[PDB]
Amino acid sequence: VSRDTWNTKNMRSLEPP
Amino acid sequence: PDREKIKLLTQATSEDGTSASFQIVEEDHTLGNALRYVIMKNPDVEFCGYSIPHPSENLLNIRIQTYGETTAVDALQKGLKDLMDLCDVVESKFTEKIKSM
Amino acid sequence: AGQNATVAVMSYSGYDIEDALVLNKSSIDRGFGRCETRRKTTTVLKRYANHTQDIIGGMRVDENGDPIWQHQSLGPDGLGEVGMKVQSGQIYINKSVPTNSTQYREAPVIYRGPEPSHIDQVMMSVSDNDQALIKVLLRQNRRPELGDKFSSRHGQKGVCGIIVKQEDMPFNDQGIVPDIIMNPHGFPSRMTVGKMIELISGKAGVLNGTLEYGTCFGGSKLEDMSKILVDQGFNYSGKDMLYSGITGECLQAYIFFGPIYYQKLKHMVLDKMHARARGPRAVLTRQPTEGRSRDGGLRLGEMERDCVIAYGASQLLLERLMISSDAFEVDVCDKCGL
Amino acid sequence: EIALFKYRKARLEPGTAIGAIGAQSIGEPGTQMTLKTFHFAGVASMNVT
Amino acid sequence: EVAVPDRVAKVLTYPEKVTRYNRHKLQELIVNGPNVHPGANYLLKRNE
Amino acid sequence: MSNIVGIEYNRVTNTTSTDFPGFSKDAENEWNVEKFKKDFEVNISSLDAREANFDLINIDTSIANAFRRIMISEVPSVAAEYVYFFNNTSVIQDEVLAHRIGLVPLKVDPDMLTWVDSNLPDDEKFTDENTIVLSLNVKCTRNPDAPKGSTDPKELYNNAHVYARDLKFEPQGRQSTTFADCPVVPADPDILLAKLRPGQEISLKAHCILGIGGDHAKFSPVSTASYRLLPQINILQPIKGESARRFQKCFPPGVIGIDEGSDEAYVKDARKDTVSREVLRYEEFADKVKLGRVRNHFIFNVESAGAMTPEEIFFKSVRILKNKAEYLKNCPITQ
Amino acid sequence: XXXXXXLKYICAECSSKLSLSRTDAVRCKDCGHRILLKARTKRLVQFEAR
Amino acid sequence: HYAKIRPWRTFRLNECVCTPYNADFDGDEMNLHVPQTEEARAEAINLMGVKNNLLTPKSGEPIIAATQDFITGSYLISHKDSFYDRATLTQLLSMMSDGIEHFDIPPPAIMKPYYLWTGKQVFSLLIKPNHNSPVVINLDAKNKVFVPPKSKSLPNEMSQNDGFVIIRGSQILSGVMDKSVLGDGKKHSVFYTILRDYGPQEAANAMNRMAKLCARFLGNRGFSIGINDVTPADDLKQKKEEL
Amino acid sequence: MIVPVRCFSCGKVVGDKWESYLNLLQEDELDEGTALSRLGLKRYCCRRMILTHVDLIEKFLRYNPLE
Amino acid sequence: VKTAETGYMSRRLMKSLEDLSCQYDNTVRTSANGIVQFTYGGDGLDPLEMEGNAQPVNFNRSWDHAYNITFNNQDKGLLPYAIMETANEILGPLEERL
Numbered sequence A: 001v002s003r004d005t006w007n008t009k010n011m012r013s014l015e016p017p
Numbered sequence B: 001p002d003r004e005k006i007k008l009l010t011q012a013t014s015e016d017g018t019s020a021s022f023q024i025v026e027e028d029h030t031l032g033n034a035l036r037y038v039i040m041k042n043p044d045v046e047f048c049g050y051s052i053p054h055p056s057e058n059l060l061n062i063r064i065q066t067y068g069e070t071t072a073v074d075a076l077q078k079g080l081k082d083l084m085d086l087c088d089v090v091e092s093k094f095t096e097k098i099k100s101m
Numbered sequence C: 001a002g003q004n005a006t007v008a009v010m011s012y013s014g015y016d017i018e019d020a021l022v023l024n025k026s027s028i029d030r031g032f033g034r035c036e037t038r039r040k041t042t043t044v045l046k047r048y049a050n051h052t053q054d055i056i057g058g059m060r061v062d063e064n065g066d067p068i069w070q071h072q073s074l075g076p077d078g079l080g081e082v083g084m085k086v087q088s089g090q091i092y093i094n095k096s097v098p099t100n101s102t103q104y105r106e107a108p109v110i111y112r113g114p115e116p117s118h119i120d121q122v123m124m125s126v127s128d129n130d131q132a133l134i135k136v137l138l139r140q141n142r143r144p145e146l147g148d149k150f151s152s153r154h155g156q157k158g159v160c161g162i163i164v165k166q167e168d169m170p171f172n173d174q175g176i177v178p179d180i181i182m183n184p185h186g187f188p189s190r191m192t193v194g195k196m197i198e199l200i201s202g203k204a205g206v207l208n209g210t211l212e213y214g215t216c217f218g219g220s221k222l223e224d225m226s227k228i229l230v231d232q233g234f235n236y237s238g239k240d241m242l243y244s245g246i247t248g249e250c251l252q253a254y255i256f257f258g259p260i261y262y263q264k265l266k267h268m269v270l271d272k273m274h275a276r277a278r279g280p281r282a283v284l285t286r287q288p289t290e291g292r293s294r295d296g297g298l299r300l301g302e303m304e305r306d307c308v309i310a311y312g313a314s315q316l317l318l319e320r321l322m323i324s325s326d327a328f329e330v331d332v333c334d335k336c337g338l
Numbered sequence D: 001e002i003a004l005f006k007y008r009k010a011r012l013e014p015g016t017a018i019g020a021i022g023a024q025s026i027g028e029p030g031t032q033m034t035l036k037t038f039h040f041a042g043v044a045s046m047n048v049t
Numbered sequence E: 001e002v003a004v005p006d007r008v009a010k011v012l013t014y015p016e017k018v019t020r021y022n023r024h025k026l027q028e029l030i031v032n033g034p035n036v037h038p039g040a041n042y043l044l045k046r047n048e
Numbered sequence F: 001m002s003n004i005v006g007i008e009y010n011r012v013t014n015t016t017s018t019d020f021p022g023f024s025k026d027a028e029n030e031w032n033v034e035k036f037k038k039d040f041e042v043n044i045s046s047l048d049a050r051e052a053n054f055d056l057i058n059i060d061t062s063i064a065n066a067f068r069r070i071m072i073s074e075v076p077s078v079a080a081e082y083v084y085f086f087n088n089t090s091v092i093q094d095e096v097l098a099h100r101i102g103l104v105p106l107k108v109d110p111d112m113l114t115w116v117d118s119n120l121p122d123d124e125k126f127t128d129e130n131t132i133v134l135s136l137n138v139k140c141t142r143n144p145d146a147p148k149g150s151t152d153p154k155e156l157y158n159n160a161h162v163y164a165r166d167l168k169f170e171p172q173g174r175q176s177t178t179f180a181d182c183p184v185v186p187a188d189p190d191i192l193l194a195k196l197r198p199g200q201e202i203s204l205k206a207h208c209i210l211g212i213g214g215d216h217a218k219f220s221p222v223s224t225a226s227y228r229l230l231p232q233i234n235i236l237q238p239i240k241g242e243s244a245r246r247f248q249k250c251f252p253p254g255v256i257g258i259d260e261g262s263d264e265a266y267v268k269d270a271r272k273d274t275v276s277r278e279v280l281r282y283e284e285f286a287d288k289v290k291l292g293r294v295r296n297h298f299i300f301n302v303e304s305a306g307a308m309t310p311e312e313i314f315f316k317s318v319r320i321l322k323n324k325a326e327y328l329k330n331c332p333i334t335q
Numbered sequence G: 001x002x003x004x005x006x007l008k009y010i011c012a013e014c015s016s017k018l019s020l021s022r023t024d025a026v027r028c029k030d031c032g033h034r035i036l037l038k039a040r041t042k043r044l045v046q047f048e049a050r
Numbered sequence H: 001h002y003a004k005i006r007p008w009r010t011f012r013l014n015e016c017v018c019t020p021y022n023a024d025f026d027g028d029e030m031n032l033h034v035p036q037t038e039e040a041r042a043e044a045i046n047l048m049g050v051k052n053n054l055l056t057p058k059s060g061e062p063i064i065a066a067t068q069d070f071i072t073g074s075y076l077i078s079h080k081d082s083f084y085d086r087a088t089l090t091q092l093l094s095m096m097s098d099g100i101e102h103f104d105i106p107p108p109a110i111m112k113p114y115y116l117w118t119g120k121q122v123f124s125l126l127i128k129p130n131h132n133s134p135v136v137i138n139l140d141a142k143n144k145v146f147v148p149p150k151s152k153s154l155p156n157e158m159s160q161n162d163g164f165v166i167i168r169g170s171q172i173l174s175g176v177m178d179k180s181v182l183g184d185g186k187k188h189s190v191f192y193t194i195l196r197d198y199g200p201q202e203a204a205n206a207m208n209r210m211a212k213l214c215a216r217f218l219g220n221r222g223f224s225i226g227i228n229d230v231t232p233a234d235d236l237k238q239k240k241e242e243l
Numbered sequence I: 001m002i003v004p005v006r007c008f009s010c011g012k013v014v015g016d017k018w019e020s021y022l023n024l025l026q027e028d029e030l031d032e033g034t035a036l037s038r039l040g041l042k043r044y045c046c047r048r049m050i051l052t053h054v055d056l057i058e059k060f061l062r063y064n065p066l067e
Numbered sequence J: 001v002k003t004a005e006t007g008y009m010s011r012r013l014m015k016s017l018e019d020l021s022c023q024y025d026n027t028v029r030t031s032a033n034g035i036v037q038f039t040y041g042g043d044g045l046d047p048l049e050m051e052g053n054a055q056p057v058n059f060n061r062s063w064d065h066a067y068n069i070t071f072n073n074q075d076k077g078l079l080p081y082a083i084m085e086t087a088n089e090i091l092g093p094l095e096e097r098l
């Protein structure tokens, strides 16, 4: 835990298709 | 250049703005309620409320009536800016508490 | 026969008036209220006086060697393959009848269904009188929709009036959402206090880990169930404080909230929806058929006729009764009224 | 003006199927009364239909 | 009003006669055809 | 009143925000960051791989419920969408089994997959960037053994139970390198999918794509995400003696305690309180206690199905809300 | 890289694979059982996991 | 009725028109007829149309009006304990319309310490939203549960409960919105008075506003029945026993 | 028939709890309530999914047609 | 029993009164043009338009509505005889017409 997973990874699913 | 997302309902619009209904497709109570709250947090806004006219349609009708200081479009744009800022503050605080833990 | 629906007894969304129910989408998505229909069709390859019998020859193809659409799920024997979907218009028994019972007139068994079915059993056998017997079982998985009928063991039936997303449903402190919302106006006039006692008994039962009893002139005592509810942290009367799903605010009334046994009744709007524009007419009367299976029309009876007369709608009378049922352009002699 | 205008509006319009309307008006409330005689408890009157 | 299923609206039709006022609409309905709901199922020509 | 939801014996009061200009003559509570920024606060209570519990403090119900709704219904996750049955001779129907496999939550992180475009042809809709392909090949046979007659089926047969862990990740295309370090497995591998007797077999492949919990429950990433207002118990007058112990019994174990020496009942931990308002039915404590809930203190509990961490789910929800506000802002308004 | 997709009879008594000839009989060859079931088709069936 | 095409397999009707049909959504089925000629279509919608038949011909009393949950929602809004700030009031008015109606917000009933609107003001805006609305309604009505004032000489609106509805210029000056003033069988109905003074279109507009408002308001306010609602108090046990 | 994968109401995965609940009841015999709480089924909807499930698949498998 | 006997009296009376309609000279007649009532109810009034107690106008509500709709504090109240003068200016032409 205590990890900023969202900063580390460049999201793709979250953007609208 | 999305030309279908948010529409201005002209039959519900006044002269010189300050009172307008916007139709926002692919929206529901999630954005409607937060937007209404933020918009009511504006001194010039005298009236704000949304409605999903029918569950079958993914459509949201948000009504803004202001006093004469600003137009409904300006109050809407300010509401969206303020919602973005609020979510940014939430993001910063939450990521900081995650890092600290 | 039923499922223990998480029920919140509250007025909600306005689609739950006069016994209509509010069903939780994503309870339905997870399998709440899911059911299947299984229907049988029986054919006999009968035998004939001229040493002849019916056959199940078929599965013809087009130029490529590809089966035609009506035979898409048929299989070489001419009996619909087990596991395959059959749509409206497709053949699953390819019955050919002799033209002189050599030549075989086609009498295929067509699937005429609004919704597709699946073939799960094809049984080939002979009857006691020596002749082949074919039975094909068609299964149709059904998902609950608007107009499907549910009941709660207390005579409080009602159709599904709206299916709402889980986030729109009210939630308690633990995030539990109702699977069904039962309107509170169905209680005061019907006076089913046993339904409320059942909600409390079932709630205390799940919390305690035990199935409870509602035996006539007995059952689990209400005060003992209240003791269980309080010991588990809940209000004794079964009323939890809920949050609105659409606003997030606490509802100003405490909501009677807990498990209730619900039955999905056989009456499903999928089997009731019927619409006729033009179709078969009776050979005698030339009027639309009387059967929903025969694409029949909806009768406009003497009482509806009385209503339309009371409105004074003469042209509507003509249109409904003569023009759109049986209008005949006859030739009438003006000398003899014949 | 209001009273006179409403009085004028009240007049039965020609063409009205007033007989059929009266038939349904006398036969609709009848579709909610018991075929067998039920009486309030304690009335103890004559058994009148 | 009454809400009518699109499934029964696709079978329950109204026989609209083409005028100079609705010709474009009726052409669009014909193009949509019997399956897309704002469509049409039958055409009766003037002289047939 | 004044930010406190009133918990009465027959009703709930003061549930609306009342923090806007036009509530009162002092047109205060205008929106501004640097007031909300300095008053808002987050207190995280716990963190797991599958559950988080944190306090959004000094935020409005509309925003908190927006995050909750986004988590439940709008945060994307990956689940099986299409099941192709090569062979299914079990008693469980094909569509029933397919629905169950859809309800199996996959441990594939989204943002590794792209959204499927459904405008494309069927032959051109699924790619190595859009889809996870899971196979399942089980054949049940009698155990070539001889234990006690009519024993449990785990040793009378082989492969008598089909678990979710039997679903095998099949890399397609370039997924063999993309997913080499994070092979796709069920989040819950002991999920019982089907039971089969000797001679029965289940052979299938399943295509798994990104989805939205509003589209189907199987796509929801949270086994429940919700909040609750912070309970508040105000003991108006001292409670002492056995009456204090009865008052203590009116609440869950740890909520209130009895001070040693003073023998007065004090509120020990209101968070552990469930608002059953048991105390509000005795007429002995009728004026000695006020129950309430802080209207802008939200105790979020976010338990994830398993594909992603609960804090990630919450951050994605905040980002989704911000993104939809920004998309609306950028969109032009059409007459 | 894209993608594509992804007369046997059973006696109801002894569960034996049978092949019905052209106009022979409708009985099991192992036992005498007179009820035969079509085995599941070989082709693919696609279901939406909903 | 005017057809409205919708996705599911049921005929749907607004609940206000359940009374004339005597329909109750427990598996009830109804028949739909499409007139096929222009003459029949015009006759149907002009003589048998819903707005033209808000009254029964047997007595002239309204028959299309608020049904159960609509009545209860109206009662809970107009209940004397209902107060609303500007935000809640405008959200209620947006629910009442589709968000496409202009509302002239009246001065709040309570101006200090807070700006609060009563529920009767909400329903006054339901009757007459803005100054362009022609509906100016005047009405006196006895609610179905009317206890008289404490003194035999006081006017009826001094009822000890909200037992008496005074409406002046579309403003509800007392009394809750009950069945007797929003339902069937009474000619002092709000919708009946709107009908008689301004026409079926405005009567139906007000009824549509009420239906949409209640359908959205009751779910978010909360209204539930429980075992405690039918549990007798401990004193009544002993009283009824000895009695 | 077979235990649902998810609680109908919350959506929690309960399909991996059926065998372990059966084992907790049979071996090291406990009460149904304590067995349910030991599996993390705290919400009463989740408790219902296991407590009320009827395992009809085991009866349906006695009629195996491919013995 | 009620569902069995629903629409019995309705049908019977429908056969009795089915052909009666109001005529353009305010008479109710059979299809054989025979007079049943020389005027409907002896009044000519439609029961669908009665706002009183089977009387066409609700005087109290109508008076309150008129007072509210024409109200103006900057207006002069007529003397008690002048109210009757205005009333008798309106009524009396219509009274002598008959």
Ligand SMILES: [Mg+2]
Binding pocket: H023, H024, H025, H026, H027, H028
């Ligand atoms: Mg009914």
Ligand SMILES: [Zn+2]
Binding pocket: C333, C334, C335, C336, C337
């Ligand atoms: Zn002749």
Ligand SMILES: [Zn+2]
Binding pocket: G011, G012, G013, G014, G015, G016, G028, G029, G030, G031, G032, G033
């Ligand atoms: Zn055999």
Ligand SMILES: [Zn+2]
Binding pocket: I007, I008, I009, I010, I011, I012, I043, I044, I045, I046, I047
């Ligand atoms: Zn659950």
